[PDB]
Design an enzyme around this catalytic site. Structure first.
Site, PDB file in Angstrom:
ATOM      1  N   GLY A 257       0.803  -1.218   0.000  1.00 34.56           N
ATOM      2  CA  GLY A 257       0.000   0.000   0.000  1.00 34.56           C
ATOM      3  C   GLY A 257       0.834   1.265   0.000  1.00 34.56           C
ATOM      4  O   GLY A 257       0.548   2.188  -0.716  1.00 34.56           O
ATOM      5  N   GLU A 260       7.369   4.328   3.754  1.00 35.47           N
ATOM      6  CA  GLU A 260       7.735   5.484   4.489  1.00 35.47           C
ATOM      7  C   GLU A 260       9.149   5.984   4.205  1.00 35.47           C
ATOM      8  O   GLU A 260       9.782   6.547   5.096  1.00 35.47           O
ATOM      9  CB  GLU A 260       7.549   5.182   5.978  1.00 35.47           C
ATOM     10  CG  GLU A 260       8.597   4.229   6.614  1.00 35.47           C
ATOM     11  CD  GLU A 260       8.179   2.764   6.537  1.00 35.47           C
ATOM     12  OE1 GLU A 260       7.266   2.424   5.728  1.00 35.47           O
ATOM     13  OE2 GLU A 260       8.779   1.945   7.281  1.00 35.47           O
ATOM     14  N   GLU A 294       2.206   6.261   7.192  1.00 37.70           N
ATOM     15  CA  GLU A 294       3.579   6.398   6.716  1.00 37.70           C
ATOM     16  C   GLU A 294       4.235   7.637   7.293  1.00 37.70           C
ATOM     17  O   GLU A 294       5.428   7.616   7.570  1.00 37.70           O
ATOM     18  CB  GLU A 294       3.680   6.389   5.230  1.00 37.70           C
ATOM     19  CG  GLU A 294       2.933   5.223   4.586  1.00 37.70           C
ATOM     20  CD  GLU A 294       3.320   3.840   5.084  1.00 37.70           C
ATOM     21  OE1 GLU A 294       4.411   3.636   5.702  1.00 37.70           O
ATOM     22  OE2 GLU A 294       2.477   2.959   4.832  1.00 37.70           O
ATOM     23  N   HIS A 297       5.596   7.015  10.747  1.00 35.48           N
ATOM     24  CA  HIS A 297       6.861   6.254  10.748  1.00 35.48           C
ATOM     25  C   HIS A 297       8.059   7.183  10.758  1.00 35.48           C
ATOM     26  O   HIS A 297       9.203   6.752  11.026  1.00 35.48           O
ATOM     27  CB  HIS A 297       6.984   5.401   9.472  1.00 35.48           C
ATOM     28  CG  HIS A 297       6.467   3.985   9.599  1.00 35.48           C
ATOM     29  ND1 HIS A 297       6.875   3.139  10.595  1.00 35.48           N
ATOM     30  CD2 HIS A 297       5.625   3.268   8.817  1.00 35.48           C
ATOM     31  CE1 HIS A 297       6.299   1.961  10.430  1.00 35.48           C
ATOM     32  NE2 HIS A 297       5.517   2.023   9.367  1.00 35.48           N
TER      33      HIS A 297
HETATM   34  C1  BES Z   1      -1.678   1.493   6.889  1.00 34.59           C
HETATM   35  C2  BES Z   1      -0.502   0.534   6.683  1.00 34.59           C
HETATM   36  C3  BES Z   1      -0.724  -0.661   7.632  1.00 34.59           C
HETATM   37  C4  BES Z   1      -0.237   0.161   5.188  1.00 34.59           C
HETATM   38  C5  BES Z   1       0.868  -0.895   4.863  1.00 34.59           C
HETATM   39  N1  BES Z   1       2.187  -0.270   4.739  1.00 34.59           N
HETATM   40  C6  BES Z   1       3.145  -0.301   5.663  1.00 34.59           C
HETATM   41  O1  BES Z   1       3.062  -0.873   6.777  1.00 34.59           O
HETATM   42  C7  BES Z   1       4.389   0.445   5.369  1.00 34.59           C
HETATM   43  O2  BES Z   1       4.535   1.154   6.574  1.00 34.59           O
HETATM   44  C8  BES Z   1       5.499  -0.595   5.233  1.00 34.59           C
HETATM   45  N2  BES Z   1       6.779  -0.196   5.826  1.00 34.59           N
HETATM   46  C9  BES Z   1       5.562  -1.006   3.788  1.00 34.59           C
HETATM   47  C10 BES Z   1       5.882  -2.490   3.502  1.00 34.59           C
HETATM   48  C11 BES Z   1       4.851  -3.470   3.462  1.00 34.59           C
HETATM   49  C12 BES Z   1       5.182  -4.819   3.132  1.00 34.59           C
HETATM   50  C13 BES Z   1       6.512  -5.167   2.854  1.00 34.59           C
HETATM   51  C14 BES Z   1       7.512  -4.223   2.867  1.00 34.59           C
HETATM   52  C15 BES Z   1       7.205  -2.909   3.201  1.00 34.59           C
HETATM   53  C16 BES Z   1       0.532  -1.632   3.570  1.00 34.59           C
HETATM   54  O3  BES Z   1      -0.147  -2.684   3.555  1.00 34.59           O
HETATM   55  O4  BES Z   1       0.979  -1.187   2.515  1.00 34.59           O
HETATM   56 NA    NA Z   2      10.786   2.850   9.020  1.00 38.65          NA
HETATM   57 ZN    ZN Z   3       4.161   0.675   8.441  1.00 36.20          ZN
END
Ligand code: BES
Ligand code: NA
Ligand code: ZN
Ligand code: NA
Ligand code: NA
Ligand code: NA
Ligand code: NA
Length: 866
Positions: A257, A260, A294, A297
């Site tokens: 999704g 950060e 994000e 973070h």
């Molecule tokens: C509102 C959030 C829980 C959305 C979530 N994104 C994140 O947690 C970002 O902070 C993550 N740091 C992105 C990520 C997700 C999977 C693998 C590697 C990196 C996502 O599902 O993309």
């Molecule tokens: Na981070």
């Molecule tokens: Zn996250």
């Protein structure tokens, strides 16, 4: 592929303090030059082991000397005989256009962009690709000016030039040391929405959102939400942004999704773009969430990072807790808490019983992308929330302040965060640490007694956590267990013991304990585990009348919804047994009556009414059963809906018409009314068919916004109403050039109750708006079919399983991370009957035999077949 173990963590033999990167950018062939300042901490014979994947090495220099003492091995460049401090220079080549997995540097439409978390930077150059190595980056980007007028990386823009042959360059400098997973680069042509936010102490931050050309009109809500996030983090946590520029880029091809990356977040356009005719209330609020998340973070993840990937929850659980607080403070806290509890009980609990089960701090990982989980995220947050519950807001914020004070600028562990909370607060959390190291969902059993002679109420509470696939040994947890006691008028009875008040969050720390309350002047109706005070399964023998009483009188809106769920649970279970014997639905009248009363309470918040009138999903229903019968669950959910529709018809239609809203606003009172109205519609859709069809086609045609239009379309599909085909065709006719809007339509197709749904799904692999090259499309069609149409996915002939195996046979090579998301419904085989098991086992064995089986799938498949 090899497992890694958290207990094997060691400080690195080498550090890198600064890295200067040069990209000579080109979709076919990008040349990367990386100059890194390094320091040996270990022993002179310990070589520098750099991670690297699919790189073409061109040269290696140490202090400008071509180096002869190195070798390449599987996934690594190993360099020997180094001095204590030296400049390393690597030149290597990579190919963005060939990167279908979307990890590292790749192509999104015409743009180039990166994804580096968790271990994607090693797909760009040879590096210490581990988050305990923090360095100051500067990034020089060189590219064709017409194709890539915008060239972006982390930090501030410090230099720029033109070159001959239509090329130009830009240089970026990010002054804050970072692990490489936070590296980002973007090259392309965009429309840019520009604004500013001034922090409470006076720093003016330029805000820039990059969207595909033409989409500028869909960007303002995301901008607004960024401003709201920044403001809220100042008001609630006292935290300010730390740079002079904040960039977000929306890209269409992205596995997750959002991300950060310091000062340059890269977002799936799904969580940026909105306009009232393309986006629902839910999309608006998800965009709010993810922008917020994000952003949050920036401190809980960036200024303090993770020492190693086993510590992922330190940032994700905590950052989820923050995005929930944010959503909750700005919106309805009850509705937030409710939906977050639906997710815990209906999905996270399932995972914590599966072969993939793990503590919020895993002890073993083969492929770290498989651990971006409901557990690490959602349960992670519940763990943080329990800390909050035990400390109260003020000590919690002290705890946050000590955490930053101690760990700003470095990489930390879960245990560090816990220790800061404990030291700032003076609350002992040594027992509580066990929640980080133990998998599985505790079950809390409560028995009570009332003594009218002594006016005492006694609770005997016991806990056990069943063994999990990953852990044979379990122990009691420190469980914060909130109660409230109600008298016969619905007033709260003061909790007290021996003359002294008693905190109503009980500390359940043992296998078994008794709590005795004095001056209980009437036999109480208890509310138990209020606010879902701990992430546990509650076993207590309610009467229906206790539950309907709580629905009328409980102080917290959460407890009212929750009681209604306990009311339904019983009759969901009853009617699943009935379904398996060929019997129709049976429901006592006083249940329908509780729902009637909700519909007509003029004082209840329509947001709350609406959640109570939203039946548990099939996934929440599944968690009531040891062995899932997905067909019976689905058909019972439908019949329950039919019954209530029939019984409450006049009330439903009244409330439907009464919550009509001429104007469309993204405002919490309006959203609430509208969410209730469409819940009413959903039942009406399953009543008398002529009226249903009229109501639904009319709403679809008259809607002045996507929320109302989609709720109609979705009801037409669910109830198989006559208008269904015509409405679906119109949506496709109108929206087919828009992938993100089409995703809605694909989800509806994939989750249809129609008999030939599989056949339609296969056909839709060739639809004009579908492609296997875009994760959003894959997830919206295939993933929604396997994960959200359990009745079809688990067709007794096994056709669902085979269809998924076909799709995963492609995705295993194309994009294994999306593959691994998609395999999940298959690794739940042990929850199903023997015959479905045998077929799912066979599917998994077929996948196990793939050539070039990815690690991502290998980990899940071997665990599931064990
Ligand atoms: C509102 C959030 C829980 C959305 C979530 N994104 C994140 O947690 C970002 O902070 C993550 N740091 C992105 C990520 C997700 C999977 C693998 C590697 C990196 C996502 O599902 O993309
Ligand atoms: Na981070
Ligand atoms: Zn996250
Ligand atoms: Na470093
Ligand atoms: Na609120
Ligand atoms: Na009792
Ligand atoms: Na409940």
């Amino acid at each position: 592929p090899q497992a890694k173990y958290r207990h094997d963590y060691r400080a690195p033999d080498y550090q890198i303090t600064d890295i200067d990167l040069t990209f000579d950018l080109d979709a076919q062939k990008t040349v990367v030059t990386a100059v890194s300042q390094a320091v040996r901490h270990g022993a002179s014979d310990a070589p520098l082991r750099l991670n690297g994947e699919d790189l073409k090495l061109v040269s290696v220099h140490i202090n400008d000397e071509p180096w002869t003492a190195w070798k390449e091995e599987e996934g690594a460049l190993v360099i020997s005989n180094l001095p204590e401090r030296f400049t390393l220079k690597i030149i290597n080549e990579i190919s963005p256009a060939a990167n279908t997995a979307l990890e590292g540097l790749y192509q999104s439409g015409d743009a180039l962009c990166t994804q580096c978390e968790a271990e994607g930077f090693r797909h760009i150059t040879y590096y210490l690709d581990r988050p305990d190595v923090l360095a100051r980056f500067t990034t020089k980007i060189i590219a064709d000016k017409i194709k890539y007028p915008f060239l972006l990386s982390n930090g501030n823009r410090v230099a720029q030039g033109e070159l001959e042959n239509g090329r130009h360059w830009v240089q970026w400098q990010d002054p804050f040391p970072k692990p490489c997973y936070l590296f980002a680069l973007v090259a392309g042509d965009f429309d840019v929405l520009r604004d500013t936010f001034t922090t409470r102490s006076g720093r003016e931050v330029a805000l820039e959102l990059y969207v595909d050309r033409g989409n500028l009109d869909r960007a303002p809500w995301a901008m607004t939400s960024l401003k709201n996030s920044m403001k809220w983090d100042e008001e609630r946590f006292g935290l300010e942004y730390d740079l002079d520029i904040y960039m977000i880029v929306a890209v269409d091809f992205f596995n997750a999704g959002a991300m950060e990356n310091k000062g340059l977040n890269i977002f799936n356009s799904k969580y940026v773009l909105a306009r009232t005719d393309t986006a629902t209330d839910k999309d608006y609020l998800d965009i709010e969430r993810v922008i917020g998340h994000e952003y949050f973070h920036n401190w809980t993840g960036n200024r303090v990072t993770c020492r190693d990937w086993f510590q992922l929850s330190l940032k994700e659980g905590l950052t989820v807790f923050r995005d929930q607080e944010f959503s909750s403070d700005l919106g309805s806290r009850a509705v937030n808490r409710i939906n977050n509890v639906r997710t815990m009980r209906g999905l996270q609990f399932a995972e914590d019983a599966s072969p993939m089960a793990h503590p919020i701090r895993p002890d073993m990982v083969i492929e770290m992308n498989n651990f971006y989980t409901l557990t690490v995220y959602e349960k992670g947050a519940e763990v943080i929330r329990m800390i909050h519950t035990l400390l109260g807001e003020e000590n919690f914020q002290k705890g946050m302040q000590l955490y930053f004070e101690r760990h700003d600028g470095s990489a930390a562990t879960c245990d560090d965060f816990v220790q800061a909370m404990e030291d700032a607060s003076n609350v002992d959390l040594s027992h509580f640490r066990r929640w980080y190291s133990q998998s599985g969902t505790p079950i809390v059993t409560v028995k009570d007694d009332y003594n009218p002679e002594t006016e005492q109420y006694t609770l005997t509470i016991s806990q056990r956590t069943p063994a999990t696939p990953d852990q044979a040994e379990k122990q009691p947890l420190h469980i914060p267990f909130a109660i409230e006691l109600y008298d016969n008028e619905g007033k709260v009875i003061p909790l007290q013991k021996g003359g002294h008040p008693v905190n109503s969050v009980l500390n359940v720390t043992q296998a078994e304990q008794t709590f005795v309350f004095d001056n209980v002047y009437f036999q109480p109706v208890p509310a138990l585990l209020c606010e879902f005070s701990a992430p546990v399964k509650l076993e207590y023998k309610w009467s229906d009348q206790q539950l309907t009483f709580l629905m009328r009188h409980a102080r917290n809106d959460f407890s009212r919804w929750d009681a209604a769920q306990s009311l339904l649970a019983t009759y969901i279970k009853l009617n699943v047994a009935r379904h398996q014997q060929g019997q129709p639905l049976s429901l006592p009248v006083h249940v329908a009556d509780a729902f009637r009363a909700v519909l007509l309470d003029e004082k209840i918040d329509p947001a709350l009414a609406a959640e109570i009138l939203t039946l548990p999903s099939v996934n929440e229903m599944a968690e009531l059963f040891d062995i899932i019968d997905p067909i019976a669950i689905a058909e019972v959910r439908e019949a329950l809906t039919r019954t209530l529709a029939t019984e409450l018809a006049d009330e439903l239609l009244a409330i439907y018409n009464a919550n009509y809203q001429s104007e469309y606003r993204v405002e919490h009172e309006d959203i609430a009314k509208r969410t209730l109205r469409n819940a009413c519609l959903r039942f009406l859709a399953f009543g008398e068919t002529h009226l249903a069809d009229v109501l639904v086609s009319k709403q679809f045609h008259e809607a002045n916004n996507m929320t109302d239009a989609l709720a109609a379309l979705s009801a037409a599909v669910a109830a198989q109403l006559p208008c269904r085909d015509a409405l679906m065709q119109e949506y496709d006719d109108k929206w087919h050039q828009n992938g993100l809007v089409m995703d809605k339509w694909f989800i509806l197709q994939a989750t249809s109750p129609a008999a030939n749904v599989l056949e339609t799904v296969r056909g839709l692999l060739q639809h004009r708006s579908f492609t296997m090259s875009n994760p959003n499309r894959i997830r919206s069609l295939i993933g929604a079919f396997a994960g959200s149409n359990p009745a079809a996915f688990h067709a007794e002939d096994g056709s669902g399983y085979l269809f998924l195996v076909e799709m995963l046979t492609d995705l295993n090579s194309r994009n294994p991370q999306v593959a691994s998301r998609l395999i999940e419904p298959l690794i739940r085989l042990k929850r199903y009957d023997a015959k479905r098991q045998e077929k799912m086992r066979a599917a998994l064995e077929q996948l196990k035999g793939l050539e070039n089986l990815s690690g991502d799938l290998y980990e899940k498949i071997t665990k599931a077949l064990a």
